[PDB]
Amino acid sequence: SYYKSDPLCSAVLIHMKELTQHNVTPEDMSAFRSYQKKLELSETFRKNYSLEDEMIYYQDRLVVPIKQQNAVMRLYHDHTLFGGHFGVTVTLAKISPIYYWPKLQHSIIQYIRTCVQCQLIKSHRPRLHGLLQPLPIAEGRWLDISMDFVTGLPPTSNNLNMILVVVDRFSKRAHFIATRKATQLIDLLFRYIFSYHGFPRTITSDRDVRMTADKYQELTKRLGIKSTMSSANHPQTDGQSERTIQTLNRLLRAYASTNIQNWHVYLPQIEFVYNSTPTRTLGKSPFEIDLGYLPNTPAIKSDDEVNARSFTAVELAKHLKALTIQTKEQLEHAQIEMETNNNQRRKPLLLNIGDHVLVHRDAYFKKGAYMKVQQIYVGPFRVVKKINDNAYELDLNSHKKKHRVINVQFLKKFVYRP
Amino acid sequence: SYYKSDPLCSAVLIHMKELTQHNVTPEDMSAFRSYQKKLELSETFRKNYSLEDEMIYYQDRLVVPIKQQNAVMRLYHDHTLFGGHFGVTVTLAKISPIYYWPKLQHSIIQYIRTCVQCQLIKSHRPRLHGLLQPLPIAEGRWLDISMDFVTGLPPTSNNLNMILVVVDRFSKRAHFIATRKTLDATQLIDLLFRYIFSYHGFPRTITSDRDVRMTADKYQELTKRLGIKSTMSSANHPQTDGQSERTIQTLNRLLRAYASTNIQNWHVYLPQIEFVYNSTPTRTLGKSPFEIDLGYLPNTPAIKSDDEVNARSFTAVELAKHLKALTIQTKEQLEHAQIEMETNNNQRRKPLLLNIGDHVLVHRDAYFYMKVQQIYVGPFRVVKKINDNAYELDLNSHKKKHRVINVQFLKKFVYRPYPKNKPISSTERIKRAHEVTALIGIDTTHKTYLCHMQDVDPTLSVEYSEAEFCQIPERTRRSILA
DNA sequence: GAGCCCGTAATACAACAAAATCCAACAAATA
DNA sequence: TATTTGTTG
DNA sequence: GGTGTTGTATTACGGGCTC
DNA sequence: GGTGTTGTATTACGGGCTC
């Protein structure tokens, strides 16, 4: 039960094979590509096709007619003759030692994008699927605020359990919100610690139940506060707070190495140390990014001046304007530097309407659902809206899934074939 | 109540600041470097020091004498005036706006290395410590072998291990047989299917992990009587079993491909996955692992355009010559593979070189709520240097579990530094017990606690028994152990 | 080209990516 | 001799 | 509307010397 | 003695044409 026991006088290679035969030319519809290929063969000298008793082949490899292309690549890709659904390299190593197939690599990668199980099972670095495209930089001071918290720490005396952080996107000002892992009184403690400065414009946070929080969201809609609400298991958007708790974790380890179970005393020292230390992407201390009144003043900084903003009373407007201008251009510099050092391999994905994208078992099933060697056979979903440049909402075929926003790091767009 | 309100007429900067005054030359022992620096200043033109009535400083930066170098770096790196124990960049951003410091960044990284807590609380890419050294290349058809376990597989007949993958390292034949956790623990039946695998040829070298199924006394001694080495891993360093784990990575994709009937009936798929994976050509050798060892390919011949040599199923007296030729081919492909691995991986990695005796931190795998507490532990003395990236060390007294740590967890320790002395008398272990810093634990063999004191030799601990343990407040001691 | 000192100063590279329970199973410690 | 308790895929 | 982001050793580029 | 390692899209380099 072997193949190639069939003559085909109507295919692309007929023009190539009549270079010796010159007998019959029964071309088909859309066979004008064969005419152009024969013209290119005529103006060049690459004649290596061998014609031996109906076996027309290349120098050592069997050229296959285009009628049975899919049959051959399915035979050497599926388990009919022990393929195994591998990549283009193993498929070439199975086919190219035996067959030639002009533009074989493009045909094989097209088949990889065609075969459904390879789309659902393979990953092929599904963490580089969209550009960086960071947050818009800022406005006037204390208008954008980043919100997140680490769920659990070694508990203190039974009054405090975990640390919440507030750092603004502009100035990156540390904060010490020590919660109890909380209730609807989140707005009480949160209000007491941001309203020390004032009400922001948008909150960059995750889809956490203390902030998804239909009771708390309506408060923000009434008050005039937006909510970015980073999607399920995509904590990258929170950013400044995540980077702060990275710096806080080192600081908390430093100040509580031998002093576990009472770190709530040292937490204001943690935030004050974070506040007094200059950063890199802005080059100035977060006091200086705000009203520059580093109160410790161990020594005067470089370019010695008055450096006493307490003496200035009415002229603070020009000083804050100057700080705002230089910090805004520094934020733009940080944005472009991040975009340069990150997008060296980040391939974009821009669809925005009418596709059948997937979600490869991350933010689709539960974060608490165990990942194992169980098959990854998420069905072909649909996309109806372009919610952002780096995400697309889906019509999750479930009860509700409680969210339908999927960042591009889980999509891996499905492609059909007739 | 600040610094710099004191004269220092004998330091390095004396020759620099007598370029305008030329009063006295009160050099000290080994202070001729000041004269050489003055000569270097004279033969060039970088004279920009400002000198006004003992306020001697740079164009905008206060130059500091070498006597109070430690005072300045401790002031702007520790917490006396709100430092924070940050990196070299933040320390520069605190110091370089205010002070000059010839070779400033070198002094800053020196202070980062010679700190007491700063080494142990932070981290800087520990994974790339040690250059990537591939294991010995190949032998006569899997005299070197690897195996490993992964779990999390769904049950079908109470079989939630089912991955005992054995990879024939030379030919990469890569067998894996269904099993379970509860069948054996290297006592009764584990060896039996190990031998039915080994029925097709005994190996000569194992490379495996620190799993309890192979660190047992029964396994090591039987392998030693079999003349086959163990060569275990290094306390959660699975990269020693890399080729088996890479086979698992290839196996997992094929397992998901064949795992549509996840729960009902799928134990027939592992031999199918074996037969598919062995027949598929690899990348590092260009030949399928099935035909590398066995010569020929499996049934339904799809013989390539090389020759008829891959249909070698005929008379066997001439198999030795061309099978050795294929051994040469595959050997060459594995030097190519070792070179390819060492190219793209050693570009960022930096080797770590320690002699026997110097202290070393382990930073992990010493105590298994490890978030805020001091997960990183104190320094230990290295005993045996097995490899350039393998140091055997005394993490505890004599307790348990294979006291060798890979260099990825290991980190250098520097004790360059008013430190106290070493108590050796019997009465000095009682009074000098309130000067403790950290804790290791309790000896399992007898009643002797090991801990760290303050401003002493860190690794060279002093034994503190119960006669001098209950007097000092131990309420804050078990807090870091729990 | 050719290298060196030194002084700044950019520069990819990785860590924040929820936290903490055991599962199965080797061998130490009493009583 | 059963119930523990260190560490590790 | 809504989607990364800085700390850190490490390393690259100008004044001043030898040419 | 004892310590990574291949699968995979993706992309870079020679024969043959226009010069």
UniProtKB/Swiss-Prot annotation, chain A:
Organism: Saccharomyces cerevisiae (strain ATCC 204508 / S288c) (Baker's yeast)
Positions of Mg(2+) 3 binding: D148, D206
Name assigned to this protein: Integrase p58
Record site: Cleavage: S10, A11
Integrase catalytic domain: residues covered: 132-294
Integrase-type zinc finger-like, as annotated region: 79-118
